[PDB]
Ligand binder design. Structure first.
Ligand code: GTP
Ligand code: GTP
Ligand code: GTP
Ligand code: GTP
Ligand code: GTP
Ligand code: GTP
Ligand code: GTP
Ligand code: GTP
Ligand code: MN
Ligand code: MN
Ligand code: MN
Ligand code: MN
Ligand code: MN
Ligand code: MN
Ligand code: MN
Ligand code: MN
Ligand code: ZN
Ligand code: ZN
Ligand code: ZN
Ligand code: ZN
Lengths: 185, 185, 185, 185, 185, 185, 185, 185
């Protein structure tokens, strides 16, 4: 089953994490972790602050490489360098409504590409991505070259967007405390 | 072949079984068992009464866990706890006309989901389902939490309905003796 | 796991079956069936009389081909013609003490041969055999030619004996009521 | 590759074979055998007369079971009983224009069914079929019951037709010497 | 790789845990968890007290079934019921020196058995075991029957001991504070 | 991943190579090699002149068979005779804009055929092809017979074109120095 | 099964074939072909004279490459160039007593080498060999270089001899009419 | 075949390379590269000077990470970070006589360990090693911690030595110009 073959990754982030804010009594990041854990056996968190908080929920924390690369691609590479799986499903800490069929639909729509990401009908979410570790070398070269754009990298690896337009508000991103209030129960 | 990789399961049921009523001289439940056995090598019955009757046809009987959980989800969990296969095709005892391509079409339409169930064009039949044992833990947690709704559980596991609208009256359910007479040869 | 990939077969037999005699309150044949069922998910009985008795324990009964071939090889061929698996573990109905690691040790010692059988340290037991269905054609030709010897056939298929000399009295065969009394609890 | 996993079978037939008539200087049956051999490594002929003629082209001949069953289903069963492969692509001896992508398109369109056959846009060709050996038991039971209809059997096994409407006159069947003249170069 | 296919399990235990005592500044249980994590990607803890302590190291905690079964077999069953993997490597919390090749050597010596455990040259360590989930049903039946002996169960499943006599004091068990002092740096 | 299972091949060619002309400071052939190397681990060059130039970029050079067959099919056969992989993705040296998802889309669209090639919306590019080595024998026979047409061969093997009409000018072929100037940065 | 994964090859030979002489009423070469066919589904003959005789038994004949290379290695290469399988079991036409477990024992003793050959206790039989097609390129280079020694080539490919010293006179080679008389029934 | 699944790596080295000295007219490093290339399809060189020389032979050059880690472990990690394969066979540039069965014997003797290295009968050669990429994370952590010993790392990963004592002088290391003269033809 996909459950035992794809490693889930919460991209908790940067260099308080807004992901710590509670939505309906549960921290945003935990909404993501719990959705991943329902679909996937082994799930880890990429975090570079508050490591103890993430770890305390029972999740292994992976810190960024000491190369000090920028942005979400840095976390993806760090996780591929420190985890042995073939496949990783990454998701940022602030998209709490990710759907229960995230991994399956991304997997089914890979069409043999080494990377796919979500398009929600209105926009791309390139950091909600199913990624094969075979692009580790390409990613390392990209970041070493000083590049940082996520979707450009994923296209250059041969990736494509996968349509989730039928999954109503599943990809809402909670940018701020104010947006969070529009969603509170 | 699918024949040797999916375990068939007749959900015979609850806590006389109407499934014992004869349709064209063969008990309703045996119509289901025979359809499954044409498609699948290893087929078992989940039953908690009349065990000897089901067993006498040459089928292994699996009784519900002693946890005493409610409804069809209880039978599904009990069967996953007592049978070693990866995949199970469950079907209630009162849908005698299930088609010869049930397993194949559900399998082909999984789209990497761990569970799929039949939609006949007019309604869902969530207990006619192809289920991967990877959702055993989720199911146990669900039932332990006191929940019982079948389709809600299957959606929460990442499942989806599969269209059988082209299979004419294959999913008729014989609810009563009277409906049975509308179908007798 | 081997449990879900090898079909167990009780060779109950010929053309009352002594296998119906009780050992410690359980019929000899059921001792074999239960040992197989502990190791293997799907287990069937090759029987040509008392079919209802074997079937009543929850086991599918396979009757001999109508070709009317002689001996245990006839049952093996009939089972391969009527069951879809790749691998079969056959055992006669009168060796009640067969060990819990029968399938694993035969499987592990195959050394890529399509058939292996037990040698108990003193003699061969050619009908206690792990057999790949690829020898179905060879077997059919053999029986069609009028041949019946079991071990000769298994050698001609490229098979070999596997040493069980360390499994103390596990291969005792209960030939008669008198031998049975030497074993009764 | 499919080339090494599916056994090709020319259904040469019955109980002179018109299949011996030359089309453009090559016997009809050899047109079929050559098309199969371009796509498949191992190809055999089911024949019950002129065995030496078929054999002389370098092809193994498989004769019908001695059960004496009727029609093309008899040949299919005989071939599954005498050949070890999992998959068989059968084709009658009088459809000389079968296409170079026959195996691939049937395989790709299986949708997990154990059997598929060609529909040419106007009619079914149920004996041009890709068949998994798992239906051997079902077939044996069917023929033993006295049944003979091909498409009924293939539906009962869970099979379906595959559309070849885009393959222009590839499924012309040469019924007679006169039809053959409409096709001669 | 084995690293991504076997789930590691620390059997932390019963119904303060001595496993919390520090050896060379690291709690005994963490010595086991760290050895497992060097060999295996996904590692969990079976604990029924101090859950927060185990969880805080980044490990998922699995609590015993509510069936309330006795002993280490209870933990094994609970973990198989709540985790989706095929294979589990269990180790008690008080054998801190387990070797770096534990999983590989147990895996390599399985000889197709569904369960193997360590023999250190002087005694069996039946709870240091590599176990296939196919024995889940057998285990459930065993515990339901009121049985508790570990090695008896593992033999009945078809398991065997694997020789680690060459791994010098790797299987020392720290029974008490006093034995711990014989080992402190 | 596809990256490690398909061998990339630059068809550099014939019996100066225009492929040596620089586009935006990089030789045309290197544009192809670099695009292949982003998608595929192991990439080689079929060249029969300037071998040292191609080799100096770190690529293994494969020279044509001494059979002296004509055209691109000759190079394909030579590469299959001298390289051990199952799958090869061939591309001529003068299509510098080949897309990053070339291998994946051809692979995904194989529909079980042993060979597929690109159709760009306006024309076929039969030498931009994903080819299974199983057609090596067919190819050898074809060339031995004196035949040379590429697309005819690929159809006779059971191949088909795959639509790349959505990949804007990715298949521009630089025929001459003048066309090259229409493309220079 | 090995039966469907290894192609058998009778090395009938050179540039009447003594292999045509009858042993116990069956031509020597047919003794080899029949032994191979008992173990392997698909078996072919490498012959460069009397092609019609070999073909008439139902076997496909493969003729040597037109490169005109010398000796048995030439036949091996020709067969790998004209047959799609991964594995080939070659045997010369004059070793009529080859054993029924030839393929299995060579396969089991490969120890991951791409080629193995028989040692009968007194001498090597390098042309009785199980060969992976991955050494096709190496073989082509070897023969192109003008080399011909068989065992030297097989060692250079990483091969080794496999002990058949326990298979009594199974590897007798019938060199002449006189030796043949020492063996006639 | 192993040929297409293990990436060969020449550890050319440090921070003229003695590996450039000619043995029998071929540079020492090329003796290693050629031995690897006979056994493995895809072979690369880890070099940090004279990159152009290594590249000119047709081999891809991989330079060390910019982390600037010390010794051969640094090269191994750099290659795993920049190459997508699962398995790597590393060999230093100065052991020109490495045997033709290096990969097979190391592979066969893995006994499920993620790393194995050569013992020649007198000493370990820890840099002649077959390594699974699953130990990439462990290696990164090891080097980050400031550790450098090779064999200690390989043991900590669960590795073991494999006996090559029967391969006469195959592991001679050419330390100097003087030792080289003891070996010159
Ligand atoms: N590992 C790592 N992750 C980062 C870094 N910077 C950002 N991220 C991750 O990248 C994703 C986007 O990060 P941010 O831009 O901080 O957060 P944001 O407000 O969600 O950004 P948008 O919603 O896309 O405007 C999140 O999952 C953050 O955890 C970084 O330097 N290292
Ligand atoms: N194992 C188990 N199965 C149950 C239980 N209750 C119901 N089922 C199974 O769930 C399915 C629906 O059960 P019922 O509601 O008894 O029967 P029904 O009249 O077919 O229900 P509907 O047609 O859906 O109105 C059937 O297959 C019954 O066998 C239970 O407590 N345990
Ligand atoms: N299917 C089938 N099985 C047979 C037939 N004859 C014998 N057997 C099976 O072959 C095995 C040996 O059969 P028997 O010779 O009847 O019984 P037995 O007294 O156990 O024979 P031995 O202990 O070997 O002297 C048993 O498993 C019987 O079930 C037959 O005609 N058909
Ligand atoms: N093995 C076997 N094959 C048969 C038998 N009868 C027919 N066939 C095969 O079934 C297919 C149809 O057979 P026929 O009805 O003889 O020939 P036909 O004139 O092609 O029939 P149609 O074109 O379908 O009208 C052919 O491939 C014949 O070889 C039989 O008794 N045994
Ligand atoms: N899940 C669970 N585990 C238990 C239970 N009882 C014991 N264990 C586990 O079984 C193993 C042996 O447990 P104990 O007898 O408490 O500890 P011990 O002093 O290590 O026992 P010995 O060293 O074998 O004398 C340990 O890993 C404890 O965690 C239980 O009731 N449930
Ligand atoms: N190996 C080999 N390759 C050849 C041979 N002839 C042509 N090719 C390859 O086939 C492809 C087409 O070759 P050409 O016709 O020389 O070049 P072209 O101008 O690109 O041809 P078009 O653009 O198709 O008009 C290229 O990749 C050339 O490298 C040959 O004799 N041997
Ligand atoms: N394809 C091919 N096979 C050859 C050629 N020469 C010999 N062989 C094969 O190589 C094997 C040995 O061939 P020979 O030396 O003719 O026959 P032999 O008398 O069996 O040789 P020994 O018994 O080894 O002394 C046989 O299987 C012959 O078929 C050749 O030129 N081409
Ligand atoms: N990538 C990398 N490789 C190194 C480094 N240092 C040494 N090596 C590799 O490690 C192996 C041993 O290196 P050296 O100690 O330079 O050479 P040596 O004289 O062969 O060493 P010994 O024979 O073991 O005494 C060789 O393959 C050198 O290429 C390094 O800093 N980086
Ligand atoms: Mn955000
Ligand atoms: Mn109902
Ligand atoms: Mn007996
Ligand atoms: Mn017809
Ligand atoms: Mn203890
Ligand atoms: Mn061109
Ligand atoms: Mn000879
Ligand atoms: Mn050195
Ligand atoms: Zn985990
Ligand atoms: Zn069954
Ligand atoms: Zn064949
Ligand atoms: Zn390469």
């Amino acid at each position: 089953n996909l459950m035992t073959t794809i490693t889930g990754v919460v991209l908790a982030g940067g260099k308080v994490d807004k992901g710590l804010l509670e939505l309906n009594g549960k921290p945003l990041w935990q909404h993501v972790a719990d959705a991943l854990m329902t679909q996937l056996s082994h799930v880890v968190v990429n975090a570079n602050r508050h490591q103890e908080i993430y770890q305390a929920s029972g999740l292994k924390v992976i810190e960024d490489s000491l190369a000090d690369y920028p942005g979400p691609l840095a976390g993806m590479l760090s996780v591929m360098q420190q985890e042995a799986g073939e496949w990783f499903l990454f998701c940022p800490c602030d998209t709490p409504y990710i759907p229960p069929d995230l991994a399956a639909r991304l997997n089914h729509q890979r069409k043999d590409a080494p990377v796919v990401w979500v398009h929600d009908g209105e926009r791309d979410h390139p950091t909600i991505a199913l990624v094969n570790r075979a692009i580790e070398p390409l990613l390392l070269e990209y970041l070493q070259a000083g590049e940082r754009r996520v979707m450009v990298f994923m296209r250059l690896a041969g990736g494509h967007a996968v349509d989730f337009s039928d999954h109503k508000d599943a990809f809402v991103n909670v940018n701020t405390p104010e947006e969070l209030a529009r969603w509170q129960e």
